[PDB]
Ligand SMILES: [Mg+2]
Ligand SMILES: [Zn+2]
């Protein structure tokens with residue numbers, strides 16, 4: 001849930017990349033292989049963060065406190 | 066903390082957030098300073114207030130941290146924004162009445178203690194792009210030269 | 225004859241025992257000299273009555289706590305002289321109503337009267353003697369929500385009715401003529417404040433209160449409409 | 456514990472963390488492999504016994 | 512529909528969330544139409560219609576037609592806090 | 596008295612002892628314990 | 641230094657399991673005894689031997 | 690890493706790889722026997738209470754519960770519950786002097802620790818007040834852990 | 837069978853075993869916690885007295 | 893064997909009662925008393941016996 005910051009191997013900061021990622025996918029229709037590149041994730045240690053990530057914090061927010 | 070995220074879950078993410086270390090040289094270690102707990106000599110104090118306003122989902126950003134502690138005019142502790150849009154690390158989300166207010170105490174350390182101090186992302190190390198030294202024999206099926214990719218750095222050494 | 229064992233520290237002897245017990249080590253130690261004190265610490269009529277009583281409370285769906293308070297009560301009465309009768313129907317209903325009271329739950333004399341035919345007045349005498357025995361062995365408000373249930377009324381209606389009952393009791397004037405009439409009238413007011421129809425005959429039937437009674441209560445209650453208004 | 460080999464003396468080396476550590480040559484007689492397996496340890500309380508273990 | 516009898520006797524609908532929290536049983540009541548007759552011999556007198564009788568409670572499987580959730584929608588479920 | 600919270604309407608109650616257990620303004624009998632005010636400390640490690 | 645052998649290397653999907661060493665390890669010396677046989681109790685939570 | 694063990698990156702662990710929460714839920718309830726003896730949630734006073742556990746009670750709020758957010762550890766007492774005692778019934782040890790109430794409080798597990806996530810109080814079917822408590826803890830991958 | 841020919845006993849520790857190459861064949865690593873729990877009742881004499889005194 | 897074994901002794905003219913240590917009570921919640929099945933059997937054998945006595 002919610003965008004692992006940094007990265008489980010290389011340690012590059014992957015957190016901020018998330019928003020711009022969804023931006024690219026929704027707005028520009030670009031496929032992931034292009035998106036991650038334009039974001040500047042060169043190694044695939046990073047790439048698996050964004051790509052494989054499953055964001056559940058959304059489905060958590062919909063409950064009333 | 067009213068958030069859906071568990072508290073220490075948050076304090077974890079905060080632990081990972083890079084900070085501006087340029088002048089860190091002159092910030093002493095915790096165990097070195099003789100005060101009790103922390104001070105402006107051994108530490109930098111950051112705090113964060115997030116109160117969800119809009120009906121739409123509000124986002125807590127790394128930029129929302131604020132430095133309350135006197136810095137003695139030395140360059141430290143500013144949460145770093147490498148994004149082009151100028152937001153940075155996404156700490157937590159909030160809906161409406163969910164509020165988050167907390168205080169962070171930033172201290173000096175090195176990676177061996179905890180990886181959240183590691184300054185360097187992956188470091189590419191290579192030598193002898195051609196195999197001339199024979200430190201490595203190549204697994205192959207028919208020929209090793211065809212199969213094994215030509216490394217880019219090969220260009221800067223002789224065939 | 226004696227047989228009671230006490231633990232005392234022969235080296236301390238200063239006080240009686242003041243010790244701690246260590247369950248994990250399963251040993252018990254004087255907190256002072258730290259000496260181990262101990263080791264290897266190890267880790268016919270009635271049944272018939274309670275049977276039929278059990279059936280009754282069961283059909284009544286009363287929670288086990290109430291059932292068991294009544295059981296306890298009945299055991300105390302049991303075979304005693306002063307009871308001197310009542311054929312086992314009166315006692316079962318009496319003890320039940322007691323356990324209801326003691327359980328802070330409320331049930332009307334009429335309700336229990338619907339589970340058992342006690343003839344009424346005979347019931348009152350038996351209940352009073354039993355009450356006296358309990359003292360020797362030494363509150364309408366609860367009814368208000370229960371009634372709403374029967375009508376399936378909103379929460380606000382119920383709490384309104386509660387405020388109404390407290391306010392009505394303080395203002396006195398007829399002292400209530402039994403609580404039941406006040407609880408039902410209090411409701412009837414509160415509901416008529418709101419748009420939700422029960423009309424009248426439906427509540428008089430459903431809750432078994434004489435329609436004339438509800439209207440009669442309504443006129444006097446209407447007179448004091450001034451001070452009964454929560455907001 | 457179906458071998459007399461399956462119960463053997465050992466010489467304790469105190470080390471941190473949680474699992475019992477032991478060399479892998481000894482994994483075969485115990486019929487042991489290191490995934491979720493567990494091993495009961497037994498300390499003798501008497502000097503006599505302590506000797507027997509070392510000597511037998 | 513699924514209901515609960517509280518100790519005091521107030522009775523109200525039961526949504527499964529609360530049902531879990533309160534150590535309850537999720538069930539609906541059952542009613543039966545009892546017609547009683549008397550003969551005297553095939554001569555027929557008797558009391559009828561007017562009864563609808565409560566035999567007992569029946570546990571109710573979630574998402575089945577009987578439970579309240581089976582008709583719920585997404586955000587509907589969110590109000591009741593049962594993850595779709 | 597000690598502060599509690601309702602299950603649904605999330606209203607602050609602070610009901611006292613011998614009030615039994617119920618919410619005021621709605622019938623929910625589920626009361627949350629209204630998190631501690633004093634500060635709690637973590638290590639980001 | 642390069643490894644004379646090359647390593648088969650890549651991502652793969654892994655699951656952590658319920659079993660966790662902390663829930664398992666226990667060590668008993670002089671605990672409580674069962675009331676019946678006055679022999680050490682059974683189980684970790686009960687601190688048995 | 691021989692024989693079905695494996696080597697894991699410590700940095701990776703430190704950065705959140707395979708970290709999981711664990712919620713334990715303790716539940717307790719006050720009851721009545723003959724309506725003569727009622728169990729009660731209360732913060733027990735060491736002075737007049739007997740058979741009392743040796744875990745520290747300092748965390749309890751007056752009602753007998755631990756307000757959430759409080760960091761707790763093993764042997765701490767989450768729920769202060771007490772029962773009445775007949776003086777003549779036992780008179781065991783100091784019970785005659787203590788006069789009053791036998792201590793029954795559900796402790797946290799001996800070996801656990803963590804932070805109390807949530808505490809809720811509710812009357813059950815038959816009206817008894819009772820409480821549940823939810824203690825979350827981060828369990829970080831460790832040497833003994835399995836995969 | 838249960839309570840005589842074999843029985844549940846004290847002075848015992850159970851945990852996961854995992855392998856280590858750097859241990860001599862006969863040893864075993866025992867984690868500090870377990871060590872700090874189990875104990876061996878040694879006897880005082882002129883030889884050990886100083887060492888024991890330190891332990892105490 | 894004339895000393896230790898007689899058919900007369902095989903038949904029961906009288907019966908031993910084990911002490912509670914054989915058949916201890918246990919407490920549930922520690923506020924509720926739990927009785928052992930052997931104790932219940934002794935209660936039965938007794939009651940049955942008393943009955944047979946009276947009827948006889
Ligand atoms: Mg195995
Ligand atoms: Zn990476």
Ligand SMILES: [Zn+2]
Pocket residue numbers: 098099100101102103104105106107108
């Ligand atoms: Zn300092």
Ligand SMILES: [Zn+2]
Pocket residue numbers: 233235236237254255256257258259
């Ligand atoms: Zn002493």
Ligand SMILES: [Zn+2]
Pocket residue numbers: 601602603604605606618619620621622623
């Ligand atoms: Zn409410």
